[PDB]
CSV table of C-alpha atoms and ligand atoms in Angstrom, one decimal:
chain,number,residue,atom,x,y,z
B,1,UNK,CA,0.0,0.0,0.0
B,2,UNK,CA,1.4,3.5,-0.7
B,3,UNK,CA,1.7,5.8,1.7
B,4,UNK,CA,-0.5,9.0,0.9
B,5,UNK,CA,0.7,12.6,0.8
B,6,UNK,CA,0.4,14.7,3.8
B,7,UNK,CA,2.2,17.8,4.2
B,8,UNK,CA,3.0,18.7,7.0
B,9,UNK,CA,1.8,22.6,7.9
B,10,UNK,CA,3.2,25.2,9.7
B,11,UNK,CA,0.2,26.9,11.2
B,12,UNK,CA,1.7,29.5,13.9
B,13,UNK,CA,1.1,32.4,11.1
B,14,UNK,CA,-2.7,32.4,11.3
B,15,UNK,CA,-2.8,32.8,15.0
B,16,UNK,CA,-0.4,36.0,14.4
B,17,UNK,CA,-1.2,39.4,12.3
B,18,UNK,CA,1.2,38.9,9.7
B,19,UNK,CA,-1.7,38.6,6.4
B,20,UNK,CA,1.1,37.7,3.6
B,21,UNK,CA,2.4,34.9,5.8
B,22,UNK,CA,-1.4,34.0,6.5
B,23,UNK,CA,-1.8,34.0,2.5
B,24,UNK,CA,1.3,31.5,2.3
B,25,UNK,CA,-0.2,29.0,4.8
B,26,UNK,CA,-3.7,29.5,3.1
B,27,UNK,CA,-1.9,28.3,-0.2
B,28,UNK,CA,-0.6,24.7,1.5
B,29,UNK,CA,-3.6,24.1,2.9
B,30,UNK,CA,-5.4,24.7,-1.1
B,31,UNK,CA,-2.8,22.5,-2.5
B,32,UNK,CA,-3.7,19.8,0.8
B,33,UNK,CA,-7.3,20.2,0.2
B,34,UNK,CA,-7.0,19.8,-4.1
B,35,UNK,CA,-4.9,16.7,-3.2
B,36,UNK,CA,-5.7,13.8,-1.1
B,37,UNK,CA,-7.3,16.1,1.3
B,38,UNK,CA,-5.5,15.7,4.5
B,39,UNK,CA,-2.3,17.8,6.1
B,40,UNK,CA,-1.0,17.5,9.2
B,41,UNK,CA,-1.3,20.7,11.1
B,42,UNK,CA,2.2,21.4,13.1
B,43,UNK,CA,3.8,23.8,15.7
B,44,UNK,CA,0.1,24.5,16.4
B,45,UNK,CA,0.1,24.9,19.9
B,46,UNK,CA,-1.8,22.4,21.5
B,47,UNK,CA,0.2,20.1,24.5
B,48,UNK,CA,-1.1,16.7,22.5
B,49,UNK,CA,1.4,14.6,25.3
B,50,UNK,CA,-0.5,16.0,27.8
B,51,UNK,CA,-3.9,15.6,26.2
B,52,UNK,CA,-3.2,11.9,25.8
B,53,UNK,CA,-1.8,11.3,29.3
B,54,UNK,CA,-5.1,12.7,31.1
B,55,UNK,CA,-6.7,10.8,28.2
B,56,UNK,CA,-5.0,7.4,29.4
B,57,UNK,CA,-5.8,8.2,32.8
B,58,UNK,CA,-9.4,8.7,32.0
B,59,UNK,CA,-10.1,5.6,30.3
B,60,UNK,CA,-8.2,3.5,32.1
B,61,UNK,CA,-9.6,4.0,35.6
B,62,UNK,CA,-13.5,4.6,34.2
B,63,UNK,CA,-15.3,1.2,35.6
B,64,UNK,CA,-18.0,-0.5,34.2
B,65,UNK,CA,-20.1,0.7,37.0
B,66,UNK,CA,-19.8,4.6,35.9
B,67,UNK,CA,-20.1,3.7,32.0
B,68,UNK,CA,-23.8,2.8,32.5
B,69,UNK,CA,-24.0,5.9,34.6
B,70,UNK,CA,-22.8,8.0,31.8
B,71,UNK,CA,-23.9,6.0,29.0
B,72,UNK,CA,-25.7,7.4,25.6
B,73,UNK,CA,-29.2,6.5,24.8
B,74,UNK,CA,-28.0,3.5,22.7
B,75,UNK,CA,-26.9,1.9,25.5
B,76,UNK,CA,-29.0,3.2,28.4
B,77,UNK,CA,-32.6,3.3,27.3
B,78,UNK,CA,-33.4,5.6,30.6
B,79,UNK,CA,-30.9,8.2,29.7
B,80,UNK,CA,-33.3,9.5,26.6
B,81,UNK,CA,-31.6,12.7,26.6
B,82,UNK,CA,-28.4,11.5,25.8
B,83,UNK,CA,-28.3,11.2,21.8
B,84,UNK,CA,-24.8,12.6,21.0
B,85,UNK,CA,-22.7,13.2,24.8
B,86,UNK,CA,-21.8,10.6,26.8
B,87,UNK,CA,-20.5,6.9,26.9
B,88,UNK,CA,-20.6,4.8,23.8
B,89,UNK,CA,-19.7,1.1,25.4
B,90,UNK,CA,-17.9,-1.9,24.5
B,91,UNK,CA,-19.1,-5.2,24.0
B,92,UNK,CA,-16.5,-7.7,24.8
B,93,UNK,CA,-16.6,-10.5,22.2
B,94,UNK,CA,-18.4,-8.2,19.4
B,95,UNK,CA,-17.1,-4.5,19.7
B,96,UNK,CA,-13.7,-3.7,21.0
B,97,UNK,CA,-13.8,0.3,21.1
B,98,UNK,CA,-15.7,2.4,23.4
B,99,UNK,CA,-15.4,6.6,23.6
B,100,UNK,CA,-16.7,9.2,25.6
B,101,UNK,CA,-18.1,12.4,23.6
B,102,UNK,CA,-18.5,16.1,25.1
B,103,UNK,CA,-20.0,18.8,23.2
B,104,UNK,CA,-19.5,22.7,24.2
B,105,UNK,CA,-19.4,23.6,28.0
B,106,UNK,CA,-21.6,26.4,27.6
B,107,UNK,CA,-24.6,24.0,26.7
B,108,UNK,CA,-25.6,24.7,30.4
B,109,UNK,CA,-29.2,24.0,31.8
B,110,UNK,CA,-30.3,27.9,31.4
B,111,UNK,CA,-29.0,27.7,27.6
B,112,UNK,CA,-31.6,28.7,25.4
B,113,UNK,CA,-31.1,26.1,22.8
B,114,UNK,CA,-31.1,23.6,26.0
B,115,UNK,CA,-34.4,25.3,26.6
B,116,UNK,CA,-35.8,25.0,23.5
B,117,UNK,CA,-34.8,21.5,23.6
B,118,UNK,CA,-33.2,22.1,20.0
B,119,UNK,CA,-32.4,18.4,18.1
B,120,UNK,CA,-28.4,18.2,18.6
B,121,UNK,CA,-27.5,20.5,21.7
B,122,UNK,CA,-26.9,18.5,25.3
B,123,UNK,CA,-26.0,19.7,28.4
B,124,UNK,CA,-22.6,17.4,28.5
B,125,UNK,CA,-22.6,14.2,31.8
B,126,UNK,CA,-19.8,14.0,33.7
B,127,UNK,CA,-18.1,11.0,35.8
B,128,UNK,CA,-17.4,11.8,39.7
B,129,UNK,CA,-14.8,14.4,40.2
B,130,UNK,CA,-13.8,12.6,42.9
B,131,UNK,CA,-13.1,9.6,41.3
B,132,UNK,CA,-11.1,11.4,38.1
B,133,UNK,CA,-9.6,14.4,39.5
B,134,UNK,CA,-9.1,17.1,37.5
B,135,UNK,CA,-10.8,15.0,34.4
B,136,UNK,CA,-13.9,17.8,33.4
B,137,UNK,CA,-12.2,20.9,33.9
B,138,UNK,CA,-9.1,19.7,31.8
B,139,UNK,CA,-12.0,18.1,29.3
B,140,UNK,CA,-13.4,21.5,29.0
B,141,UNK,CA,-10.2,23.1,29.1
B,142,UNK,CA,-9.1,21.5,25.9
B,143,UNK,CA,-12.8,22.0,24.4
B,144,UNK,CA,-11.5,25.3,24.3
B,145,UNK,CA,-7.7,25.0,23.2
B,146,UNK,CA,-8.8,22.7,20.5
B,147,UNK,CA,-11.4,25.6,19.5
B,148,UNK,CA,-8.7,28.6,19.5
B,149,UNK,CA,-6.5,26.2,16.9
B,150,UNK,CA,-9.7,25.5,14.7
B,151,UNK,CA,-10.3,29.0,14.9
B,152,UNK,CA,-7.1,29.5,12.8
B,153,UNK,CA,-7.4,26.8,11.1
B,154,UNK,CA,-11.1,28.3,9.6
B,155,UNK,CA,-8.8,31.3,8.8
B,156,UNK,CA,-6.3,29.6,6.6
B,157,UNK,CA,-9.2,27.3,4.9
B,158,UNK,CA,-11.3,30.9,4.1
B,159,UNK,CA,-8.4,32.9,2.9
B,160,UNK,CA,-7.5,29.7,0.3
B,161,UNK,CA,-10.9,29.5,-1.1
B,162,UNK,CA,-10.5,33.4,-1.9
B,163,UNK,CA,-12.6,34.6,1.3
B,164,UNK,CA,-12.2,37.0,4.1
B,165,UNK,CA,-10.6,35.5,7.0
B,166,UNK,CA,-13.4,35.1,9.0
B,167,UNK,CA,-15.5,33.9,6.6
B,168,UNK,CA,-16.3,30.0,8.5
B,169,UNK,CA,-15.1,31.4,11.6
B,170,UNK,CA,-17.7,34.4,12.0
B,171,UNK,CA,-20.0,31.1,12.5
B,172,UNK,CA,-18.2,29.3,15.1
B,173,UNK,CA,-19.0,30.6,18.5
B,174,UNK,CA,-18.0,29.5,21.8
B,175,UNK,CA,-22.0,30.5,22.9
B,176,UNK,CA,-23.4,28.4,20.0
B,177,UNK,CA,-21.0,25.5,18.3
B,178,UNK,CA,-22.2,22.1,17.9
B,179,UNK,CA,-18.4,21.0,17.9
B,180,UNK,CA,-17.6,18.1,19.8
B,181,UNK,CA,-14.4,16.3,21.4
B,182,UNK,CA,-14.7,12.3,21.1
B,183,UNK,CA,-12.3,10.4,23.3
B,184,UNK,CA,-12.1,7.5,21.9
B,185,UNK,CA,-10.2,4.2,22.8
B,186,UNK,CA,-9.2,1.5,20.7
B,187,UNK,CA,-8.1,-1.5,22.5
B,188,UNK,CA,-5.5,-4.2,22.5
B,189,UNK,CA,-7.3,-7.4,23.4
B,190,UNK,CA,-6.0,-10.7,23.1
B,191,UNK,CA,-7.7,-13.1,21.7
B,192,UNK,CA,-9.1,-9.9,19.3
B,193,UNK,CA,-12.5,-11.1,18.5
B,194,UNK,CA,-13.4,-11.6,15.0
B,195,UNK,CA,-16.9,-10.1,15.5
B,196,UNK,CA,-15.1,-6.4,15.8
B,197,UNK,CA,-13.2,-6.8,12.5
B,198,UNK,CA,-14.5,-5.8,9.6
B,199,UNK,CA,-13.0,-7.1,6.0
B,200,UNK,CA,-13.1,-4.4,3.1
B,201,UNK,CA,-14.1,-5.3,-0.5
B,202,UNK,CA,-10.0,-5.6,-1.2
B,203,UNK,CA,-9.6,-8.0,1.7
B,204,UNK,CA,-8.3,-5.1,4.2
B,205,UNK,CA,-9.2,-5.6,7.7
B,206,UNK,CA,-10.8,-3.0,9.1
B,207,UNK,CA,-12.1,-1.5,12.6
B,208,UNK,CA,-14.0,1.6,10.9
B,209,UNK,CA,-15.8,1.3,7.4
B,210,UNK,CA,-15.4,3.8,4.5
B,211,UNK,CA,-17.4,7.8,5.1
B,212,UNK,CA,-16.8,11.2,4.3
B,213,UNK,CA,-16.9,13.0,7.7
B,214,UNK,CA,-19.9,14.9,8.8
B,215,UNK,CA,-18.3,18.4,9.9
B,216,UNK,CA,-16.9,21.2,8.6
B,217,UNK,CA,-13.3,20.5,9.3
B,218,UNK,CA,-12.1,17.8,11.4
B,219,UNK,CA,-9.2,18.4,13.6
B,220,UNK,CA,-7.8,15.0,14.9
B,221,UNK,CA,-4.8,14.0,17.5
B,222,UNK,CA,-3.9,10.3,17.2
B,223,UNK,CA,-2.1,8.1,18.9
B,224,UNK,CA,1.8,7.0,17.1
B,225,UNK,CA,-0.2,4.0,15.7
B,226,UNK,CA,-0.6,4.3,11.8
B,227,UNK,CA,-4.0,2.8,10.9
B,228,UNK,CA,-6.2,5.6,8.6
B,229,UNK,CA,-6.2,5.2,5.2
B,230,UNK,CA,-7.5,7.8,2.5
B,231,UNK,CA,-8.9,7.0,-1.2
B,232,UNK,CA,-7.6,8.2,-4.0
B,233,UNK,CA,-7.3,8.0,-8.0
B,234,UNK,CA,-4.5,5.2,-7.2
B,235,UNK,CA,-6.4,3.7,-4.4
B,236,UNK,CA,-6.6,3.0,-0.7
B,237,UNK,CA,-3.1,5.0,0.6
B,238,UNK,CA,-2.2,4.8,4.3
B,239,UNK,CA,-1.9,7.8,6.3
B,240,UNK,CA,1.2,7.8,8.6
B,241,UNK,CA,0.6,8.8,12.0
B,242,UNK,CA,2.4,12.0,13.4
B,243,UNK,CA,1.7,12.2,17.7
B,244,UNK,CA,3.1,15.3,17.4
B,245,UNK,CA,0.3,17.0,15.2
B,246,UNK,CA,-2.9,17.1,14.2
B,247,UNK,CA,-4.3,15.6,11.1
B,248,UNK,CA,-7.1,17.6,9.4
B,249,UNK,CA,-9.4,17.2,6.6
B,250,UNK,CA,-12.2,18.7,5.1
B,251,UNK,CA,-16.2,17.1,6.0
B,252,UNK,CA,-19.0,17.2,3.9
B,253,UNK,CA,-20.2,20.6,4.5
B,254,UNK,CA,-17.1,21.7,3.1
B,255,UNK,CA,-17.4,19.6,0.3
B,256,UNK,CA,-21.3,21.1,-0.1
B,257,UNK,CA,-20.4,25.1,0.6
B,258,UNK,CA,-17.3,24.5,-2.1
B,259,UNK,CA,-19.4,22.7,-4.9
B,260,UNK,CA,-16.7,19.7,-4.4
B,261,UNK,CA,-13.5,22.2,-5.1
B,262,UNK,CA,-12.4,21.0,-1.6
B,263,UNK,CA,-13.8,17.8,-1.5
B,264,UNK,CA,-14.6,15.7,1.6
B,265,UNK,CA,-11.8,12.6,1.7
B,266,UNK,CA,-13.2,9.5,2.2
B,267,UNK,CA,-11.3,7.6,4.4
B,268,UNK,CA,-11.4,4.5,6.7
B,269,UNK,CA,-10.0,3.0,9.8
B,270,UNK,CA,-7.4,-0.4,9.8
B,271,UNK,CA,-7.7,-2.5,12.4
B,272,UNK,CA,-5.0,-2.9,14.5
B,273,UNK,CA,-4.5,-4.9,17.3
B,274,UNK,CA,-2.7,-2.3,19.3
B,275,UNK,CA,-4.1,0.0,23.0
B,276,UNK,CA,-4.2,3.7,20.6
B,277,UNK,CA,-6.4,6.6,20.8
B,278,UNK,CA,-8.3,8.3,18.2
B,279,UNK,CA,-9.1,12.0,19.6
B,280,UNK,CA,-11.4,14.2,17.3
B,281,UNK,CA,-12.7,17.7,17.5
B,282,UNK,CA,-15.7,18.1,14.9
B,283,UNK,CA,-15.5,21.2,13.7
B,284,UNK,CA,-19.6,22.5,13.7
B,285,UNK,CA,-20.7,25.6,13.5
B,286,UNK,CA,-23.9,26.8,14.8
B,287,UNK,CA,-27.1,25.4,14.6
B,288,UNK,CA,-29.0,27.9,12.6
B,289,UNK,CA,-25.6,28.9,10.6
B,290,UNK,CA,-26.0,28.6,6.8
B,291,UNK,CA,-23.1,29.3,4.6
B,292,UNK,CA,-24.5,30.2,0.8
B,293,UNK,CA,-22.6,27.6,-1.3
B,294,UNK,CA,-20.2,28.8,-3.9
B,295,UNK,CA,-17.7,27.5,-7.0
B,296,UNK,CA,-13.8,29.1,-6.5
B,297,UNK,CA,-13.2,27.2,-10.0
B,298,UNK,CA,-16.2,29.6,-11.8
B,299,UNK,CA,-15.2,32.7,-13.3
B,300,UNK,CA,-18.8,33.9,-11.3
B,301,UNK,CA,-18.6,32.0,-8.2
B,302,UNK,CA,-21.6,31.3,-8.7
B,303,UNK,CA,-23.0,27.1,-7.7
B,304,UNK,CA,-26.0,25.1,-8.4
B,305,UNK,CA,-26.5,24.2,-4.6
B,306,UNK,CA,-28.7,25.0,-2.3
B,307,UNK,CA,-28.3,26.4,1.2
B,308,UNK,CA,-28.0,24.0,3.6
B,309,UNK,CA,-28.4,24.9,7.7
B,310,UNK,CA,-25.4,23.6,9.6
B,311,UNK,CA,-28.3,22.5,12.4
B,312,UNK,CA,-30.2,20.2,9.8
B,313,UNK,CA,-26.8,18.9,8.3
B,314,UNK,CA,-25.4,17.6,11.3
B,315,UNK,CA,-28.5,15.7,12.8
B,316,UNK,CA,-29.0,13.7,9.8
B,317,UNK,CA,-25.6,13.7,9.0
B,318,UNK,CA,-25.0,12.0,12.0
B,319,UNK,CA,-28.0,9.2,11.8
B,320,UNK,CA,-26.6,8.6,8.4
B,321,UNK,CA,-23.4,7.8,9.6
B,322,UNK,CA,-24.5,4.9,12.3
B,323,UNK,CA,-27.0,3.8,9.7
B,324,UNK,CA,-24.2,3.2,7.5
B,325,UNK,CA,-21.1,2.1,9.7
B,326,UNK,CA,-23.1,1.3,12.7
B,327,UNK,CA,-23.7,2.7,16.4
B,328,UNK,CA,-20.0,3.3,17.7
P,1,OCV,C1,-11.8,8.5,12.0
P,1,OCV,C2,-11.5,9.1,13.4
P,1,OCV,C3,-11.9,10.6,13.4
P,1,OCV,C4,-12.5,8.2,14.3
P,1,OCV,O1,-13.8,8.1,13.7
P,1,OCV,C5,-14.9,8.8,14.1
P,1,OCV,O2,-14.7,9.5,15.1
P,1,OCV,C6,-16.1,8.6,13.3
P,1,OCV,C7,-15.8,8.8,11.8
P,1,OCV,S1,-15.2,10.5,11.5
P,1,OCV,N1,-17.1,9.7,13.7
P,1,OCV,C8,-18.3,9.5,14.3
P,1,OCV,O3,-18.5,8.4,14.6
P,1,OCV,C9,-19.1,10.7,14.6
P,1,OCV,C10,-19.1,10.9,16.1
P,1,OCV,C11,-20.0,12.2,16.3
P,1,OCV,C12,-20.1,12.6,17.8
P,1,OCV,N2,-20.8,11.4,18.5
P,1,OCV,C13,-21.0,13.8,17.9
P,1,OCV,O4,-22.1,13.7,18.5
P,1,OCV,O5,-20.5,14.9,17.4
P,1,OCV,C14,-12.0,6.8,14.6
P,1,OCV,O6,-12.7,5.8,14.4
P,1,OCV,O7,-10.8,6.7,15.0
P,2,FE2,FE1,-13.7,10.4,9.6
């Protein structure tokens, strides 16, 4: 298998005021986004050793006991709130990884989308702080680190498609994002059951199926365990992993507000019998945010697609996605 091209980015400029330097950056991440669609973002900030220590420390004290208590709907048929945040269990023999998924901290009871009891916004559960110290304020902490690096990030991606700067960004709010953080842990088991491995239609073994991601952006930390791979025109390439950045690619709404230009990379998931993580920030924007779709390869800019809201794109983006790969 070939390995895939993924540049690696030197983001510091669009956190900074120097615009020509912004405009260089900007023109990597067009040539990433024309290509096989993913870059690694680098020297972007973020203490990624520290984010996967607290991580470990996380998932490896969590007891059974406490998933139940924290459990999505899918799992827990009396927590009927809990569609998106929460814990998504293993099933030893079938399933091998299990996750835990926040969504923005300022989805507080007294939230008026909370109110309103708007499809897609939670008010985020939490296990016993005295059972993993520190574990939600450094959760929420790093809600918001990620957010200040996909801040920029929206920068670079709107100055390449010929935008203003804040042209994605003037949508993503700390009061109103649908981001989320998944925490997600992929197991070493031995035996590895054969029920949690999937075979693709080339005979690759697989722990994740083939999708396009539903988000704008997603801005992912991983583990030093290679196991994405990407389509292409010459096929299924693999991704090499990089612990020491993050690897970002466009989702569908990209793909939809850009008619294609920068499409969204479908990708998939080897399995691996290997303890990794698999940390992603979904890059959302608001609800009720609606971005008119456009065509940078059209002397007019003109596109044949509709507008879409980013509320109504992400609920059913997100039921398609277990009806197709199944409930993770
Ligand atoms: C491919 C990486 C990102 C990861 O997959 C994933 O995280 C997969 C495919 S992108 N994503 C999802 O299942 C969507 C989780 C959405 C989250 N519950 C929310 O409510 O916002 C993996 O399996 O390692
Ligand atoms: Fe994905």
């Amino acid at each position: 298998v070939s390995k895939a091209n993924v540049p690696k980015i030197d983001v510091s400029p669009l956190f900074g005021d120097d615009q020509a330097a912004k405009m260089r950056v900007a023109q990597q991440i067009d040539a990433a986004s024309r290509d096989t669609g993913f870059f690694y973002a680098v020297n972007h900030g973020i203490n990624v050793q520290r984010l996967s220590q607290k991580t470990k420390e996380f998932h490896m004290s969590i007891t059974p006991e406490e998933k139940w208590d924290l459990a999505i709907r899918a799992y827990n048929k009396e927590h009927q709130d809990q569609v998106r945040a929460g814990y998504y269990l293993s099933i030893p023999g079938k399933k091998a990884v299990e996750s835990f998924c926040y969504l923005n901290p300022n989805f507080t009871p007294d939230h008026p989308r909370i109110q309103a009891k708007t499809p897609t916004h939670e008010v985020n559960v939490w296990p016993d702080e005295t059972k993993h110290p520190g574990f939600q304020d450094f959760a929420e902490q790093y809600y918001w680190d990620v957010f200040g690096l996909s801040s920029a990030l929206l920068k670079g991606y709107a100055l390449a498609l010929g935008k203003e700067e804040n042209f994605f960004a003037r949508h993503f709010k700390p009061d109103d994002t649908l981001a989320s953080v998944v925490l997600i842990r992929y197991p070493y088991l031995d035996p590895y059951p054969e029920a949690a491995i999937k075979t693709a239609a080339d005979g690759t073994k697989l722990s994740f199926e083939w999708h396009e991601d539903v988000s704008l952006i997603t801005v992912l930390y991983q583990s030093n365990v290679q196991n994405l791979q990407v389509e292409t025109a010459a096929g299924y390439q693999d991704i090499e992993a990089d612990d020491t950045g993050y690897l970002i690619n466009c989702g569908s709404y990209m793909a939809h507000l850009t008619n294609n230009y920068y499409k969204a990379p479908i990708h998939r998931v080897k399995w691996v019998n290997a303890e990794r993580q698999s940390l992603p920030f979904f890059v959302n924007l608001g609800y009720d945010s609606v971005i008119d779709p456009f065509d940078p390869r059209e002397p007019n800019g003109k596109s044949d697609r509709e507008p879409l809201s980013y509320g109504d794109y992400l609920q059913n983006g997100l039921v398609s996605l277990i009806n197709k790969n199944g409930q993770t």
